[PDB]
Enzyme design. Sequence first.
Site, PDB file in Angstrom:
ATOM      1  N   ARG A   1     -13.937   3.075 -18.453  1.00 18.34           N
ATOM      2  CA  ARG A   1     -13.291   3.926 -17.120  1.00 18.34           C
ATOM      3  C   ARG A   1     -14.438   4.108 -16.425  1.00 18.34           C
ATOM      4  O   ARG A   1     -14.344   4.043 -14.940  1.00 18.34           O
ATOM      5  CB  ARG A   1     -12.132   4.952 -17.669  1.00 18.34           C
ATOM      6  CG  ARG A   1     -11.968   5.687 -16.259  1.00 18.34           C
ATOM      7  CD  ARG A   1     -10.949   6.740 -16.724  1.00 18.34           C
ATOM      8  NE  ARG A   1     -10.727   6.817 -18.079  1.00 18.34           N
ATOM      9  CZ  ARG A   1     -11.823   8.434 -17.954  1.00 18.34           C
ATOM     10  NH1 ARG A   1     -11.931   9.255 -16.964  1.00 18.34           N
ATOM     11  NH2 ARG A   1     -11.461   8.911 -19.244  1.00 18.34           N
TER      12      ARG A   1
ATOM     13  N   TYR B   1      -0.068  -2.593   5.878  1.00 18.52           N
ATOM     14  CA  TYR B   1       1.038  -3.295   5.174  1.00 18.52           C
ATOM     15  C   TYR B   1       1.626  -1.884   4.405  1.00 18.52           C
ATOM     16  O   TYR B   1       1.317  -0.644   4.652  1.00 18.52           O
ATOM     17  CB  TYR B   1      -0.417  -3.250   3.285  1.00 18.52           C
ATOM     18  CG  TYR B   1       0.691  -3.690   1.988  1.00 18.52           C
ATOM     19  CD1 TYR B   1       1.158  -5.135   1.875  1.00 18.52           C
ATOM     20  CD2 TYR B   1       0.748  -3.226   1.022  1.00 18.52           C
ATOM     21  CE1 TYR B   1       1.927  -4.775   1.036  1.00 18.52           C
ATOM     22  CE2 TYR B   1       0.830  -2.980  -0.010  1.00 18.52           C
ATOM     23  CZ  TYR B   1       1.480  -4.513  -0.101  1.00 18.52           C
ATOM     24  OH  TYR B   1       2.089  -4.333  -2.012  1.00 18.52           O
TER      25      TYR B   1
ATOM     26  N   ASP C   1      -9.328  -2.208   6.327  1.00 18.62           N
ATOM     27  CA  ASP C   1      -8.486  -2.988   5.310  1.00 18.62           C
ATOM     28  C   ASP C   1      -8.882  -4.744   5.724  1.00 18.62           C
ATOM     29  O   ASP C   1      -8.650  -4.865   6.312  1.00 18.62           O
ATOM     30  CB  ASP C   1      -7.043  -2.598   4.869  1.00 18.62           C
ATOM     31  CG  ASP C   1      -6.731  -3.252   3.276  1.00 18.62           C
ATOM     32  OD1 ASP C   1      -7.170  -4.418   3.259  1.00 18.62           O
ATOM     33  OD2 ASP C   1      -5.611  -2.839   3.125  1.00 18.62           O
TER      34      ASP C   1
ATOM     35  N   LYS D   1      -5.895 -11.091  -3.449  1.00 19.05           N
ATOM     36  CA  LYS D   1      -5.070 -12.018  -2.098  1.00 19.05           C
ATOM     37  C   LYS D   1      -6.325 -12.914  -2.003  1.00 19.05           C
ATOM     38  O   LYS D   1      -6.227 -13.453  -3.526  1.00 19.05           O
ATOM     39  CB  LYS D   1      -5.073 -11.318  -0.707  1.00 19.05           C
ATOM     40  CG  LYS D   1      -3.995 -10.221  -1.008  1.00 19.05           C
ATOM     41  CD  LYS D   1      -2.777 -10.232  -2.093  1.00 19.05           C
ATOM     42  CE  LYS D   1      -2.443  -9.279  -1.654  1.00 19.05           C
ATOM     43  NZ  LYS D   1      -1.449  -8.240  -0.601  1.00 19.05           N
TER      44      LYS D   1
END
Lengths: 395, 395, 395, 395
Positions: free
Chosen positions: A58, A111, A183, A208
């Site tokens: 983590r 988005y 972004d 993507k």
Amino acid sequence: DCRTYGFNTQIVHAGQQPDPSTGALSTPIFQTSTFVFDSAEQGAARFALEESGYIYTRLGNPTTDALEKKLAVLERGEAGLATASGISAITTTLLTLCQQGDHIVSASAIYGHTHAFLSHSMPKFGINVSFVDAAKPEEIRAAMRPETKVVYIETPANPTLSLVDIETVAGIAHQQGALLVVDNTFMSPYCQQPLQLGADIVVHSVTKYINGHGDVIGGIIVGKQEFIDQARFVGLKDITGGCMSPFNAWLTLRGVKTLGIRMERHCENALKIARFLEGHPSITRVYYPGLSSHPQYELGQRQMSLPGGIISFEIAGGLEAGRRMINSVELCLLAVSLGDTETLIQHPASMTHSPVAPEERLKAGITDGLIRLSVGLEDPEDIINDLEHAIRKAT
Amino acid sequence: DCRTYGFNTQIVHAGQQPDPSTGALSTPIFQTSTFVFDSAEQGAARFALEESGYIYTRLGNPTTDALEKKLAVLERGEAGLATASGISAITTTLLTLCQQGDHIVSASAIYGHTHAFLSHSMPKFGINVSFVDAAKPEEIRAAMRPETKVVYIETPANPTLSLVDIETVAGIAHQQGALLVVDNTFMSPYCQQPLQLGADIVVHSVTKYINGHGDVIGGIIVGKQEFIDQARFVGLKDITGGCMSPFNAWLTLRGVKTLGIRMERHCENALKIARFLEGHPSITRVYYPGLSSHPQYELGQRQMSLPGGIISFEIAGGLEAGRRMINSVELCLLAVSLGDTETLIQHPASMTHSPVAPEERLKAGITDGLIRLSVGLEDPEDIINDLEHAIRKAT
Amino acid sequence: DCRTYGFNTQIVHAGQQPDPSTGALSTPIFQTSTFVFDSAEQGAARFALEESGYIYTRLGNPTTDALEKKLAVLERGEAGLATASGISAITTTLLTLCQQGDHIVSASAIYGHTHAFLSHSMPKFGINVSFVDAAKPEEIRAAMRPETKVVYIETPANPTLSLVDIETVAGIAHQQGALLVVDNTFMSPYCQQPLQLGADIVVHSVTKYINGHGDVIGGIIVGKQEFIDQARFVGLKDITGGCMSPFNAWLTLRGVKTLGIRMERHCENALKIARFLEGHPSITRVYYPGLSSHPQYELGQRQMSLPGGIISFEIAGGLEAGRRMINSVELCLLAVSLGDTETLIQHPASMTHSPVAPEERLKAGITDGLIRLSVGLEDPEDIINDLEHAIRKAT
Amino acid sequence: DCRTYGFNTQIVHAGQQPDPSTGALSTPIFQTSTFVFDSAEQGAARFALEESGYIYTRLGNPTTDALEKKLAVLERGEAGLATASGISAITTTLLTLCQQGDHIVSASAIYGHTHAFLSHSMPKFGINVSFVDAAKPEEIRAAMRPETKVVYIETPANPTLSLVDIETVAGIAHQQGALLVVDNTFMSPYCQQPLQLGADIVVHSVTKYINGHGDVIGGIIVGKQEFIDQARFVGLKDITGGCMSPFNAWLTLRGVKTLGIRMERHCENALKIARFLEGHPSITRVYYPGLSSHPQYELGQRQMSLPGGIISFEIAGGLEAGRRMINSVELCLLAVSLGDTETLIQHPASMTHSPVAPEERLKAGITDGLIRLSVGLEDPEDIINDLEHAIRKAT
Ligand SMILES: CCCC[C@H](NCc1c(COP(=O)(O)O)cnc(C)c1O)C(=O)O
Ligand SMILES: CCCC[C@H](NCc1c(COP(=O)(O)O)cnc(C)c1O)C(=O)O
Ligand SMILES: CCCC[C@H](NCc1c(COP(=O)(O)O)cnc(C)c1O)C(=O)O
Ligand SMILES: CCCC[C@H](NCc1c(COP(=O)(O)O)cnc(C)c1O)C(=O)O
């Protein structure tokens, strides 16, 4: 030093080297939760951040570290941080930066799930958000407040692939004491480098183009070391818990090896398809940065090395036409993601936004005839034939 | 109906069946980002939550769905939600439930990164937290406010494996209009079922016993459908982005097949080792719920079907002794996780908490001689010999 | 030295250690085809087998090497060699050992695809095979020839779980100058150790109990270093090409961690189910080594530490009854493998051997009412209820 | 019908479609050993090959089936069969076709482990092999016997990338009643299609360009359905056991998505590098089919759509120069595989063939100064600079 080679060389090599213990060329999949220490002393040396090495996945993992380093090199950033999803890259970033009483200026053309987080979740934590048309840098300036910590933009932006002038916006944000977060999902570092234009932080959904293969959900954040260390050790560790699995990191490393040749082919294909659509009398509009009638075409030429793999277009005859068209394709696949090797198509007014009031969709840039296309690696002639056949049928 | 079989049968079968299209017995690894629709209409039918099926893996995935269903059955909950990490299970839960102005009552004796999130991150979002000794249910009652939305507990709790009376605390929380959230990581559903005792929500780090193999970071949330739907469609989708990768879900499904036989062996081993340590004149204290001198022994017998696989103990001679001991084991491995097939050992005062002021550690239950042991699946005689050898050396 | 610990400790630890470069506890997945050298000299040093290290995964891989070492320790053999399948373990072995003009004595009661390889493929390479009833060691002796290189046995053997006296057969084979190869798939090293009884080579399909999770096809060979080196560098490298993928090796390493606790539970379950079936008036025969009426019961007690997880039985009423029964189970799953966590059931006369002439099947031990059961990790009461319900229905 | 689209479209789509039950776009990883039947009847219907569907992954698997179908389409063959390795593809093929007393005519200039199998293993099974210079089709004709079942060739061939005239050789083999088997590894179907030139069977190591990512060992066979059914149900099932793992099949499916764009870039790069080397006064010879001085240049132009990604060359100064050169590269990686995204380099006289007598190596085409280069996806300018620097140093 990998920061010295050409960009294709960096795509292949940066962040990676043969395994030191074995020589394995592929980065090993360190699919582990924990890591063993040689002694009490070595365990202590790592926890206080007093000595380098691994503790627990983590917190950090060698496979994920390779991906983070590679993407930092490709965006010309100091450091990278991988996450569970594109959403987690954005929220880890913003929840690290902001607290109750702070403010964010955001583009409106972002988005959808980002917009939901900004519109509904942030204000419930005392963090206010002002939405503006980021194609108009003056609206960004006018919305800035003493409490504004971040300006947030996407470029190109859905649904009509409008642009934002990164360099100009960065200057405005910095003059007013704010960070600019971009972004860069739609472009990838191969096509646009927001840090080189003055952005402070770049985020991606690696889901993507960076991964490119339609089989990984993930995100990445790139920025200065001081910031990334806070995003890792507070944002991820404490707040979102949004770590990336080592397997997903390995898959994304594998996918990104072909980023340059994939982007070249996506964009070559998309330009051909966009020109075809622009010549088609049944198509009222075509949104593509590579078309010279795009309203920010010159900006795009300065800011983007290629015009991208995504096209939006409007079919004659509104909703029923859009529905008939997407129902008539045989090769393009009906789906809502983008940046995969297969060509994907969606008609938001009948698919995603079908229950949304027709007038709200219009305010949002979503006309009844709007189709969005993610251009894949197929022969463009086959995609064109498929579109041609479906458009003819739909009209 | 899988909810009708015995618990071992459920461990193996619940949430799973042969693939309908092929008969494959193993749940397929649906390592995909997106999902294709047959028509515009089918795409629409899914988005409005008007028809069932898949859209996009951040929202839902068939592999992860199997894991969620299995864990819901095992905890006797309505629904499950898998996450990127145990941290993400906790934060997704609490960030879904709470907003600016709300309050949480939390046990003090909780996992360290949970405590950091509660102590530092929550208040920065306007969410206040009161910490109490949850072994004393009256302190929980006294800390409740009109704004208290959640009571949060772990049982057993680190570092001395103290307990919390779930049923009693649930009654107190509900009388005062709050939800009870229980972290059941240490026990697994095989050993403790907080929902059956009145808890509203259970969380786990599946990183520990549920997966069991030391190779997955992940979490799970179990609770009512109405809640889980909010945790999925707002908490995960919008806020943390903390989705689990399909591969990690498959690994956890695979790991959980042996949960029952693993827990039986962990606990059989741990009881033997705890008895050995209790008889050892160099060991001042042994913390284990299976020992009758445990201060909440009877509660443990009512609430837990087995006493667990974790033991803490104090070695004569404080810090230097603890360090010498952990440096002298040959079989036990020095690491900070738990619930793996290998026996793991840590000495928090020299390892993790070495820079923390000795008096702060003491307030926190961490004495200089405290050792924590996660008992694995080795022959217990070999673990005992290894401990014996290292204790002799250390003293 | 891992060869010194208890068997459960070896199951967990042998062949494995934390990664030297990182401390990762899980063996890394070295999912690579090639390996890089530091210099021309290091490349040369490896090829001549003049210096240790990796070259290319078909030749050797660190993940697979861990599995090979672990299984060598568990079978008390010098070395191990992983393969693509159980078939490949057998054929790699026999094709390494034998050439045109050689002879093999084989048990008749062997796995069907093994029998096909021996009956049809071997003779086409000039290698003759004599089949015998290996429950009668004298038939093995009588079939030996000057050209006999190998005696090949399986124990227990399908379909009626008859046994072969390994120690006795080994002595006979060695007196006559032959090697004994034992397929130990049905038992695993936890339950039977043919090398300790004088066998030269052990093979397994790790597809069954060693992996245990129904998600890996693979094999392993264990024997002397000199032999294994020939099986690797000629048999695998040149002849079968049957290498195991690193991912499959990692999965099998993961599966084998629970071998001891799985075998204990499989066998505890199977003994209960076998006793139930033996008491059932609709069941004419029950084949299980744990039943005292088994014709080689005492041998089994000497040779096997547990009686295994597989049961065969005959249902009253022949073919139609067997078909009705397997069609009436709700929990047991209809499938042809064994050694998975789920209970599997098959009726060879209606399933696999349905086109085979009824009298040929009878010669082969396959009566019309014969059912084969692989007992899983479910609650035995649930399996018994399911069988009871289906038997009642079928009769 | 996927056989109707353009070749890039086929690369992306052939053999694949969205999962029928879920719509998942990525082919699911069916990481299973067995498959469940709905009834006795369905189990029977599959075994006799009387009804389609899956039984057991060694026999067939949906993930592997997609890969087999895709490669059959790309080679314009009826059917495909995936294997554990390139070696296993070759040996499964030849061991299916041939038995004691049969004969094979083979090119001499073939992959080394293929040559070992043909030289040493085949004759031990009674199968004789005659080696010939397959650049001279008359030597193939002259070596044919009444017992010749197969003619076996590779083109281009190591180490000097000589060619074989597939069409001419096919005609000669067929006139004399033999099958032609072509190893098409070096080219991939994107660059050469031996079936379209009259070959009967194509084999590949998918380890090289088809997978392309340096992380999969595997093979494939393509040919007529009648043959492939024998290779599957006898060769693989009985003889070699060389099945491909579903995970490896999925990885290869993923890798092959970019085959077209990878081959274009490998070959564009390689032509540039080959021209650079041809102009370099320290380089005595350059072997590359794209250079017009190649002795079979015109044949290459007819038979190959691109000249490939592999280059061999000879450096001035023999063994010591070759060693100094490979020791002086900083970007190219020293390794023995090919067809990866990284540029790989090897000097067989100092690396692989260092213990082989210098005069034997010369007979084999391996001169002391011969270097082999697998050109990757890096910027060619960076590879050229690296070679230039190392050549300057070495001389
Ligand atoms: C569910 C709708 C599909 C998502 C997809 N866009 C997803 C997406 C994200 C979020 O990333 P993750 O999905 O990895 O969290 C962030 N940023 C951009 C620009 C995006 O397009 C689209 O088709 O727009
Ligand atoms: C990094 C320290 C090791 C973590 C480990 N406890 C982790 C842990 C978590 C957090 O889960 P994740 O790691 O999946 O996010 C939640 N809840 C409990 C009880 C835990 O013990 C321990 O050894 O206590
Ligand atoms: C296809 C029939 C199922 C196979 C299974 N026996 C398979 C099997 C093998 C072959 O191993 P692989 O499948 O890994 O090559 C070897 N040895 C034994 C004893 C076996 O039972 C059975 O149910 O008997
Ligand atoms: C170990 C030497 C490296 C192998 C590599 N050639 C391997 C290779 C094979 C064998 O395939 P597999 O390795 O998948 O079994 C078959 N055919 C060709 C042409 C090959 O080059 C080379 O560099 O030539």
